[PDB]
């Protein structure tokens, strides 16, 4: 889906499989966190479905030894002195010593400030211990978390549930047309993007000799040349668009290991899984009611949340019993208007926009005479190939960008019995729509319930309308205070700040690095996990936020601002928390998840409608839903569901006929599946018989 998803996948630890255990053979004890996972397996990133606890992500600094165990680094403490000597310990090796937490106060020389320090001890025992007892200590605060989990700002303020959802949904982010790095970051974005491998890094230092949208040629210092080719509009495994764009320009000095071109969800080498959106935290006329999201049509007009998706369509021409299927533009009983977009071969031409049902590859298959309906044979007499053309499935629509043809006649090695094979690539530019799923990094998820015009949105004092409205009620229950903090800092990053340096450094910013006392608008900041911005420093920064171009400070020290209702004009009675939040577009879009069926294919054995959207199947009226009908007493609706609407071979056809005739619905018959049941009970030497009121067995 996006580079982070692939990286995490390659760093997975799965408990299932041969030699391990079966899913039915995994109690509540194999799945919960174990005290030895510290610094080795993340306790957060794990699915919440039936595979919870069985699939983990390797910790950041963890490695694997030749034996197979997972080692993690620790700083050796000599005599109450922190040393830069780093040694990797296994689980049992770690238990034989005692380690101090990463965020212990340390002297500039290495001596611990406090005599007592937090220490982890054998058997997963946490307690304070004297400074003269610490043998090792943790390397970094984020030592215990995964790559994705380390990508959550203010992670220390989010509960493990919403944090799990945030880390798991970051892997569901959709690559946008254009990518924007987040204002509020963590530091992990860079290395995540680079080590993911979906960018283009220079192997050896040099200068850019010639750069194009197609490739980038680097002239090294020694004299050699290396050319990196950009992957453009490539279909990902999940339909997302993997598109690389050069960053450097012609004649640019580039060092070794520098990002010269970044791909999907990347900006100057950092993971850009979403966009920075101006957020207001307020209820709005019920359109954002519990977890629904309201968005500004700006995001539609300016393609802020637009994404590219590519589908692969495939068809083959085989040898049949009565001849061979041929791919031809000449299709029986097809107008010249539908075939207007096809080339001479029956293939759609590049650039043509195709709706659902349109022909992409015209293939006809010869059908024998002994397979014709009596009405079909008469219609053939009263007026030998049938239509098997490749049509666009329901719900698909885009520009045809690529075609690939393989012909047995032309040396192309196809499976025995195939003469030709055509693959058509269709690309769709999906704008954000009502019902698409967005989410933040703190398990704060929601669908789009309404996209209002830019003028309807509550706008700030200077006229800038907000971009996204989140309901307030679904905030304090989930215990994801992160977003709140993230919101505040977000604004401080957009506007910048200037701390009063005169009369000394204020008492709150004494611990802030000198690089933070001044920040320009659209500044990039990092809030490392379990370190980073503390609530006090954030309070101060809100106190010293930069003014706008007119010289006015829009948000208060509390972080709230006065908004105007764009529909009525009256300002909202109370100040509202306003900021910038990083929102991602998740891969759960109505364009894919919408489905409906009148009729369609039926399973041959059970004669019940197929399942799944891809097979044009129907929804399953399960057992519980039958209980619902019975509870309502809707007897006729239940019979209808289980007979004429399902597997009544004659009943469903008579229903179709009665609908197109305007007549009434006929009487349901017997389900074919029950006939199958009787035959199956007979196959087990059980004589099942249906008796009438008189007693005679009926056939």
């Amino acid at each position: 889906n996006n580079p982070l998803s692939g990286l995490t996948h390659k760093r997975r630890l799965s408990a299932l499989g041969p030699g391990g255990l079966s899913r039915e053979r995994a109690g509540l004890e194999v799945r919960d966190v174990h005290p030895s996972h510290y610094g080795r397996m993340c306790p957060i990133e794990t699915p919440e479905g039936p595979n919870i606890g069985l699939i983990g992500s390797l910790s950041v600094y963890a490695r694997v030894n030749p034996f197979g165990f997972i080692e993690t680094p620790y700083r050796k403490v000599v005599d109450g002195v922190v040393s830069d000597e780093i040694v990797y310990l296994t689980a049992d090796e770690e238990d034989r010593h005692v380690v101090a937490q990463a965020n212990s106060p340390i002297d500039a020389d290495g001596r611990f400030v406090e005599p007592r320090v937090l220490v982890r001890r054998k058997a997963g025992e946490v307690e304070y211990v004297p400074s003269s007892e610490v043998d090792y200590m943790d390397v970094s605060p984020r030592q215990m978390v995964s790559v994705a989990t380390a990508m959550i700002p203010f992670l220390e303020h989010d509960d493990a549930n919403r944090a799990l959802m945030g880390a798991n949904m970051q892997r569901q982010a959709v690559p946008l047309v254009r990518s924007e790095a987040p204002l509020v970051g963590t530091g992990m974005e860079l290395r995540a993007a680079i080590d993911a491998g979906d960018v283009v890094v220079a192997e050896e230092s040099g200068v850019i000799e010639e750069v194009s949208a197609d490739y980038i040629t680097v002239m090294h210092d020694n004299g050699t040349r290396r050319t990196y080719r950009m992957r453009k509009f490539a279909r990902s495994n999940h339909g997302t668009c993997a598109n690389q764009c050069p960053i450097v320009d012609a004649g640019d000095r580039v060092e070794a290991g520098q990002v010269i071109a970044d791909g999907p969800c990347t900006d100057d080498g950092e993971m850009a899984l979403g966009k920075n959106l101006l957020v207001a935290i307020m209820p709005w006329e019920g359109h954002n009611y519990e977890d629904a999201i309201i968005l500004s049509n700006r995001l539609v007009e300016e393609d802020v949340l637009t994404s590219i998706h590519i589908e692969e369509h495939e068809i083959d021409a085989r040898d049949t019993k009565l001849g061979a299927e041929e791919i031809t533009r000449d299709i029986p009983n097809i107008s010249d208007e539908v075939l207007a977009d096809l080339d001479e071969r029956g293939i759609v031409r590049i650039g043509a926009e195709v709706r659902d049902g349109d022909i992409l590859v015209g293939k006809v298959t010869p059908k024998g005479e002994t397979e014709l309906t009596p009405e079909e044979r008469l219609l053939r007499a009263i007026f030998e190939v049938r239509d098997t053309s490749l049509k666009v499935p329901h719900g698909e629509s885009g520009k045809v960008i690529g075609i690939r043809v393989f012909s047995r006649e032309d040396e192309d090695e196809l499976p025995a019995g195939v003469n030709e094979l055509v693959r058509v690539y269709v690309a769709q530019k999906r704008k954000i729509s009502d019902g698409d799923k967005l989410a933040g990094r703190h398990g704060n998820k929601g669908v789009i319930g309404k996209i209002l015009p830019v003028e309807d949105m509550p706008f700030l004092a200077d006229g800038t309308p907000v971009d996204i409205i989140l309901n307030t009620h679904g905030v304090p229950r989930r215990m994801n205070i992160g977003q709140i903090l993230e919101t505040h800092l977000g604004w401080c990053a957009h506007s910048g700040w200037k701390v009063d340096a005169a009369k000394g450094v204020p008492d709150w910013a004494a611990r802030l690095p000198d690089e933070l006392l001044e920040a320009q608008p659209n500044a990039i900041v990092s809030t490392p996990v379990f370190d980073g911005a503390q609530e006090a420093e954030l309070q101060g920064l809100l106190s010293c936020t930069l003014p706008n171009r007119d010289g006015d400070v829009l948000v208060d020290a509390d972080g709230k601002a006065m908004l105007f209702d764009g529909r009525s004009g009256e300002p909202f009675p109370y100040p509202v928390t306003v900021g910038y939040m990083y929102i991602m577009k998740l891969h759960h879009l109505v364009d894919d998840k919408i489905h409906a069926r009148s009729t369609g294919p039926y399973s041959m054995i059970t004669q019940q409608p197929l399942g799944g959207k891809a097979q044009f199947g129907g929804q399953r009226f399960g057992e519980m839903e039958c209980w619902a009908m019975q509870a309502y007493g809707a007897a006729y609706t239940l019979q209808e569901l289980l007979t004429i609407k399902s597997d009544d071979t004659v009943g469903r056809v008579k229903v179709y006929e009665a609908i197109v005739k305007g007549e009434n619905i006929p009487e349901p018959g017997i389900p074919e599946s029950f006939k199958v049941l009787l035959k199956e009970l007979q196959s087990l030497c059980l004589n099942v018989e249906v008796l009438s009121s008189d007693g005679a067995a009926i056939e």
């Binding site: 970094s140 530091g187 860079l190 290395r191 080498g269």
Partner: peptide, 23 residues
């Protein structure tokens, strides 16, 4: 500064603890 090794954008960190070993 944050991640000063490849030539990346200068992302400023609220970091209080130094990183002895890079990822």
């Amino acid at each position: 500064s944050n991640n000063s090794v490849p030539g990346a954008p200068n992302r400023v960190s609220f970091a209080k603890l130094r990183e002895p070993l890079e990822v």
